[PDB]
Symmetry: C4
Subunit: 242 residues, 4 copies
């Protein structure tokens, strides 16, 4: 699995995409002096960044760009444990790259905090944890319905469908935590500007738990695969034919 050429491209796509998703998301959501971006303006910019990069590099990788989605798929028994590590690693590296790039290009009067995930003052950690859970649970459940081959119903454009599920997440999430759902999107500018949150665990735990719940529902409860124990073991190592 790991030594093949398809595995090299697939992981590169996750790095490359997460770079651009983070560059465009953060770049669009800076406190620009020309005109401070609106809540819709931001929410579409992320959900067009996910919807565009799904269409481009979803053939190459799978189009995760998201540790939570990757980990949800892993817990759902959709991917190998080796993949999960490299994908997640590529995403986390890519996010730092994209954040890093933005640091260079943007003028100071815009830059500020590089659009890090700021928790709202009236909002708490335990409150913001349940939001990032939901925000990512619907995105996870949207993805898995949109890219299950067993579906007979008309999917249409799962690129711009999954894309818009991000824009849905941002029009609520901007208020509670500045929106995250992607642990890499949080971890990117936190490393570049070199400043973590006290509630940075929320941006990991919330989405990673939120996404895994969707996977537990969709892949075991609602739409089971019906495979033997030894069939499932070979999938996680990376030796499934079928």
């Amino acid at each position: 699995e790991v030594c093949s050429v398809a595995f090299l491209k697939a992981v590169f796509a996750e790095f490359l995409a997460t770079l651009i998703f983070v560059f465009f998301g953060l770049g669009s959501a800076l406190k620009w002096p020309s005109a401070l971006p609106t809540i819709l303006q931001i929410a579409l910019a992320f959900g067009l960044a996910i919807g565009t990069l799904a269409q481009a590099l979803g053939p190459v990788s799978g189009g995760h760009i998201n540790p939570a989605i990757t980990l949800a798929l892993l817990v759902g028994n959709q991917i190998s444990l080796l993949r999960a590590f490299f994908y997640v690693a590529a995403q986390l590296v890519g996010a730092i790259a994209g954040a890093g790039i933005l640091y260079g290009v943007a003028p100071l009067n815009a830059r500020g905090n590089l659009a890090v995930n700021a928790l709202n003052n009236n909002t708490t950690q335990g409150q913001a944890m349940v939001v990032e859970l939901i925000l990512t649970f619907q995105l996870a459940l949207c993805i898995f319905a949109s890219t299950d081959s067993r579906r007979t119903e008309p999917v249409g454009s799962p690129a711009l469908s999954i894309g818009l599920s991000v824009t849905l997440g941002h029009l609520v999430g901007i208020y509670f935590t500045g929106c995250s759902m992607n642990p890499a999107r949080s971890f990117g500018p936190a490393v570049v500007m070199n400043r973590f949150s006290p509630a940075h665990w929320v941006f990991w735990v919330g989405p990673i738990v939120g996404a895994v719940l969707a996977a537990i529902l969709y892949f075991y409860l609602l739409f089971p695969n019906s495979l033997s124990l030894s069939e499932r073991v070979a999938i996680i190592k990376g030796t499934y034919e079928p």
Copy 2:
């Protein structure tokens, strides 16, 4: 007599509960009176509609994806579903819709609470003038739901869930300006359950959607594109004993 014993039904009812819940949370949540930056009309419209259009793509394959008692009844009135299904489905939708606003209650900050974005009248416009519009909104929506769930279509549908989502966004682009846009009893009931009794124009948000949805269910499923079946099988549907 029967369609309940199957686990496919058990999943289908829960999927409505689960779906209806999230639509409310995101609809209301996007609609809350945010002091950080109050939501524009276009914003609230998109967030409401993209909630439906995503949930259709997610749980439409599991439950049909009504996410609304108006469509649940207008599918019973159009002869698309049995009695015992629409009994449990609206039972799921309302139960779900309560939990969804109640979680927004359980998380939202007190400065942004505002109203919990509940449906409330315009002072310049009467209860009659508002009852007229809730027909129009759910009519065109149900017409578009029924048209895009019709398997007979040879025309290129392309994207069902996004076109249904953009119908709900079209619904709010004008329907916010009157009552806050119901197009949905569970969306207007669920949050208003956090109080006690009925408000002044509460009947408007039940009759308006259910009537509107049924007029498309007459026009589409009886007049425009009928079915041509016997009363032996039309009764077998309503019981739920059809193959």
Copy 3:
């Protein structure tokens, strides 16, 4: 003669009445001068284009779904419909537009009703200018509608209604700063009759869209993607008889 008296054609023009009722109801309804919060340019444009795009999906299989006498009278010149199909459609679109505009006045209160989202020129844009815009605003819309609904298309069309619907929106994002964006003569003639006001340049709102749509047909149908049919076949279409058909139903095998 038989084409008209069939039960298929009853629903085929009734849907144009019901569509243009709902289009000019929703479209104009988002563009009122509201007190609560004045609708933005992007908020208007989307509501018009999504009205088109939501109706074209729902009542596309019924009538085809023009919801526009500029579009219908371009199909007649492009040789896609009969002369009695084009006549009865245009009537129901203008009757629908006035029927919708009538229902809109009946709910919108004193304060908000205002001028009922009627079209009007920009103060620095003359009649010599404003017609050239409304041509191009609708030329592009026709070209999208033709290429999206043409069954000769090999490429993946996607969703045809939304693709078309968001060409109306795109028309509004420029059109409002010149006219309030008509692109549809019925959407001008819908409110103008109800509130009982016509301008010194209402000739721009009729001729501009229809001419733009018809000049797209000359390009698309005759230059870009030609037909290859005889003069007898062209006259057969205009009068309203053409074969072969598909799935005529009935027996026997």
Copy 4:
């Protein structure tokens, strides 16, 4: 070149780039009635590509962008002469679209005919790197959407490509007014006759970014598997596979 299909294709590149530059620039004028918002301008520019793809895409390929034309020629999808006359058509079409706007636009809203303006806090070097990333991502979507080898559900190539221009504009506006299109930069620059010393960025930025995406797509990521004779034949303009 002498063929009838080439005429229509080159004419459609003129006509589309003309209609693109009209709709692109006109939505972002100094409108005294109501100044255009940022999301509005992104959606205007974006949907012009997402509509002219649907219409004139079948005719020409739906380039409307000398950077995308040159990227494909490097990636090995067209002949030398096809690109030459495509670029010429786009650049002329752009000037026509702008020179058309000179007549119809009023004086009070006019502005500078909406030419790309480099944010004066940002340098030449930085603007180039954004314009690269704006156009690299645009082209990298295009090639995947328009790839006939695609097994995945394609969606509407037209719409997903138009929104990559929207996405492009959501960030690019703050740096340059967003170009990603040497003709859209050149077009209004000839009508008003206003060339900055920083005009080279609008050519070099998108072109370099588009070339990288093509090289990455067609050679590295998704290989072709064809001989040099077939590749030279594509550059010279002589090819016909299957029936």
